[PDB]
Amino acid sequence: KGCSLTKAQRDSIEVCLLSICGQLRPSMMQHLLRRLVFDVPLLNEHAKMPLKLLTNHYERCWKYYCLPGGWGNFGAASEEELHLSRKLFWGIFDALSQKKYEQELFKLALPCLSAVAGALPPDYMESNYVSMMEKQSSMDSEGNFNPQPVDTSNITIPEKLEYFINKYAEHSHDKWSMDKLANGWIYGEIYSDSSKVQPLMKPYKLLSEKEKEIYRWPIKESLKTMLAWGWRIERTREGDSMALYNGYSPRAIDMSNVTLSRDLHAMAEMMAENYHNIWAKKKKMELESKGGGNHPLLVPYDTLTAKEKAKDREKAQDILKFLQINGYAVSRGFKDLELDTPSIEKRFAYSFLQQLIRYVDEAHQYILEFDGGSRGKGEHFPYEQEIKFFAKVVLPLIDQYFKNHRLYFLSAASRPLCSGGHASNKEKEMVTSLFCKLGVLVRHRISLFGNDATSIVNCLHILGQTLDARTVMKTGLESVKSALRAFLDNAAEDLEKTMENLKQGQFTKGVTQIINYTTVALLPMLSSLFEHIGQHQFGEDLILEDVQVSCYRILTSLYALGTSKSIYVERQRSALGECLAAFAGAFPVAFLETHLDKHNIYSIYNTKSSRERAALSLPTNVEDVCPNIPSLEKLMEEIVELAESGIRYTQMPHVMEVILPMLCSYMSRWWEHGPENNPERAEMCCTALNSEHMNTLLGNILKIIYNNLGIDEGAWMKRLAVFSQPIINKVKPQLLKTHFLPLMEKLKKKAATVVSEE
């Protein structure tokens, strides 16, 4: 923090400090954190080193502070540093939000925020009782040394403590009997350092009360400071043992054998710090009276070394042990006032995403008034640093937070992260509302984004992985429910308008921006939603009512995409195909199975009553609502005929590459939803697709690739192989033997190609 150093000197001190702290044992750095706590938010020139130290040591202790056990050898968190670190995160975040955008400083501080947010347990209960009476010596604005103690003149010692006072003054007179004997002084008329003649041989009982008061005054001040801190003192029967029991040589007493407890040790550490603060006040008055100079011990007590700590430590020890021997029971300063643990609001993630959704809604309304004023000539941003801070810190902050807490956000104490630490139902509701806000923030603003639209699509991807449908439905605020419904409906409508403008714009300005927005954000994020929902099994139950007709619309649009053919469609075809495969898994109806669609009672087409058939606008048939989609057996006739065809990947690629991921993503889930895989309602259940039929489809695809080798093939069938190792695993190993093993030897012939064959 000193400024007289050269640039090279600053570099050397920074490297040395970051190394020592880097290999330093994690628990020991608590005092250094709490000294850094108030200096970090300044964000001065000196602050880059605190930011880097914060980043590196928190990234090192990513496991430690999150795990309730931490690292077993290094223990776990104390929650005092956790309360300090939440203040760190909030101070840094709010300061950076309100103060001017510097590119270097805020790309350096962003990883610091990420590390702090990750290390802080999202499940953490902000206790109503937190660290208080904050030691202010480190809170001096300059030189972090203002050693004012807690004033205690107002309080007064009570009457039962007078016997304690007499006994402890007896102990003091005894240890100075030993002190005078040790340095050599003996009884005489008057006190003399010359001949070691020294008249205090007389007992405590008859000692003069003035000379007794010389012993009181330190004892009196110590007891007053003890009482002002609030420590409850309780009286035991060992004390009246003394009363029933009731010059001289104070005869050998044995101090050292007794020992204290750890809570009393922290208690005594703070009392010793208080005594050092009183000593440092006295030294400050004497130094100001002097007018100049410095003292080696002028540094705060935490900055001190053990040798000077020894005097305070021992003199606190002695009074404490004599207090046990006297029988008093010292406790903490004040009882707990209340517990904020019942409320899920005090959960750290809850407040974090609280101010996060306020900031996100603020950014969304700022971009709304920018859509309004962007037709004006002035393109300047009054909220420039607001939105740049948002997009390049908050959005990365959200991304890193949800990545670090993959399982936490999925955790509802219902076995996801069964160790504990569940994201609350309201927290997951407000996660879904954050997803909705991100979507409505990203609708048709790619050009307005300064290429950070890729960051935003990754944000939407991550928020798509972080979802919990059961929790949202069984417990969900109606506003958030409507937000998600309007989300899905608006996404479907956006795709329907892009489908209609692509039929009318079959031949291939603002329409280019719209289609690029679609293919870069909307299709990938819907695909991510679809992948997450299907993989995490909540597809069927996220899809109950009118969300089914929304997904029917999305299916019609997606199949129109699959049947649409252009050069830009070919360029963005991989995203299209992955969207197709994702939605097939998400979609709950065997829409291919034209004959066996209707009978499933689990569908809207069965729950649809009759009055609200007529209320809605429906083609009245599961096939008339989707006229273009073909019947499953007809597509499988198509698949077999393309087996005997073996069409080329550069001659006839469209149908043959669009349909294969479709069917694979279908049967991957509707095999285990097939008639043999569901023993209940067999051949009457959702589907009829079976192991022999998919095995024929395997041999079929692997027969087309045989002809496809002539044109050196393409990567998307390697993507199919990626899709199909799950297929190979979930197919019975008996079908592997004698059919798929000859396929391994046939593909052993195919090993001539440079590409890696499975």
Next chain:
Amino acid sequence: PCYEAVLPKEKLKVEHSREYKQERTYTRDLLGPTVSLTQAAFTPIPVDTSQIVLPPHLERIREKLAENIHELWVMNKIELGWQYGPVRDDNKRQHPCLVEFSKLPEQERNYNLQMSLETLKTLLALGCHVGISDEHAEDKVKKMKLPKNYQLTSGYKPAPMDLSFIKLTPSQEAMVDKLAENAHNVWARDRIRQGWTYGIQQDVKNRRNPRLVPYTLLDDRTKKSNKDSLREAVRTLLGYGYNLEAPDQDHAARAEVCSGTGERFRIFRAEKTYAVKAGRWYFEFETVTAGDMRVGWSRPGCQPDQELGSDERAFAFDGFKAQRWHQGNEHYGRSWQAGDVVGCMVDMNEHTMMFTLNGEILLDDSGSELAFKDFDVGDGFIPVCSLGVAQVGRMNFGKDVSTLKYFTICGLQEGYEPFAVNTNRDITMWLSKRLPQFLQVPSNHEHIEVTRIDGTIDSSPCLKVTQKSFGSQNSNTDIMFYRLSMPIECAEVFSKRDDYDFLMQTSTYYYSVRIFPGQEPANVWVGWITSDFHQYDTGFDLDRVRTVTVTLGDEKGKVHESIKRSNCYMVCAGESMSPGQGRNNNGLEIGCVVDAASGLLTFIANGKELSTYYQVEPSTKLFPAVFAQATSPNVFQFELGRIKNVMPLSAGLFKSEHKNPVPQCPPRLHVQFLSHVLWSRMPNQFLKVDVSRISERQGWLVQCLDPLQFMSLHIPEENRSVD
């Protein structure tokens, strides 16, 4: 009769008292520590509710709850076809409950009034927050079908509302079950207050009830009666609109810690002589249950008290957490289930080791198949297994190759050999000893250190006990048990300057123990113990010592002789000391005086004769012992001194010094301490005992007809014998 003590579900058998019986080696079910059987003592514990006061809402609706419970009687007795009358006799079918609470006995009316009050109060103490929803839910009442059969005689119509549209949340139903359990506990407690005790049959003369059982063991019929009554009551309370927002499902972690005594795991291993230094070896571990089990290979220096794989002696595999253990724990393999068979393999030449689960090779976090990458041959490896609480396992050394289940699919091709592939005899199996024994304090002990102070011209020889753990963490704040290695023999028959003739004819011996200042005296006990003392409790008290009073009487029944036997004859220093906390300045020399000719144990403390005295039985072997919980680095010290007219301890202990008044401390005498680090040998063969029920007429027959004998090596000094 003793058959009346059988719990209703279990059937009476006659088993072996000990766990292990005579059977095949590979079928022998190795057993871990058993769960403590605390359910035998069914103490009905009620949740305390007297401290809680009714909130104002419940206070103003108390009258409506009284009306509701009156409606409950007048529906229950009328829904069962029952009618009304003064005496509650079931044969004439008369009950006053169908009539108004006024004619109904006010005492039972109020009894049910407040037991419904503490019903809602137990809901409150359980976190059930019974508050009114709205005044609608009280102003509206539905009307039930009230035929003549369902008709009542009181004005309180039993037609509040049909409970079909009212649903009780699943957690609320579970708490209803809990409160029904609480009501059953209240009933059982009242019966205990009257003195009722459980019996399989029902009696009123002996006044015994089979209904006096925990709710889990209660019969389904009474379960359903109480269930329907209390569920209907809570449902009607909800119908009154006082909705109760159910307290959360607070998940409970039983922590599986209920083992009898401090034993957490039982370690089984083969004999140290079968250690392997070379070759490929294989053996199978069959898991009867799934839980805290570890199997692997251990060195001959494995400690029976430490858990396998915590330190270097053992290389074990824990599938419960799916972790390999050697000086630590790293993720390895998967978790097994009940019936899964683990196959352990070792290569002593390639220095590799790996495991199998039902045949497949377990994989590390990396793709490598080696459980432990490399190690040193050292002194060889031996098969080992540790079993947790309520765990059953089987170890097959492969003496019969056919008995190995997965050896053919894995292990045979690789060239691994069964551990007992070429053995004519079964492998002797050693286990961790349950019962602690006294042994000499090791010089390398991490907490206890003993120094021997030679006797000077003015000081008697002393043995000083110190703790090196103090002043540092890991210091064990547990009561250590100490004793001297050599006993005093009391006379075979009991008779019915100090003088150098009295001192030569006397048989009274003395040792003293000085408690060092700063060591808390009430934490230290001094006296004598016998060879039978095998009790290791973290908390020790003189009231807990094992005692028995054998009384032998003449032919009428007069007690002509009473003998009290105990293994511990010791006193506390805190009670012996008079000045209390004002002392601890110096001293506290407790003196123990033993009269070998009369068996009188007298204790002196700071020159005064203590009140406590013990009279022992002839030929008792007494070991000088001191039990202390160390609160100071220096805790107590044996002083082998003497007082006036009292023989020294060495004279009693040794025979060559029988007439030597000078105190001595020969090297044989040394401090011994109680510990659990000892192995026990399972016998190769057990007695052939068969047990069966001959008939109801004849009972259970047990029969042993084969004689087995074993050599017992008797250590003379310690008065114990081992095989």
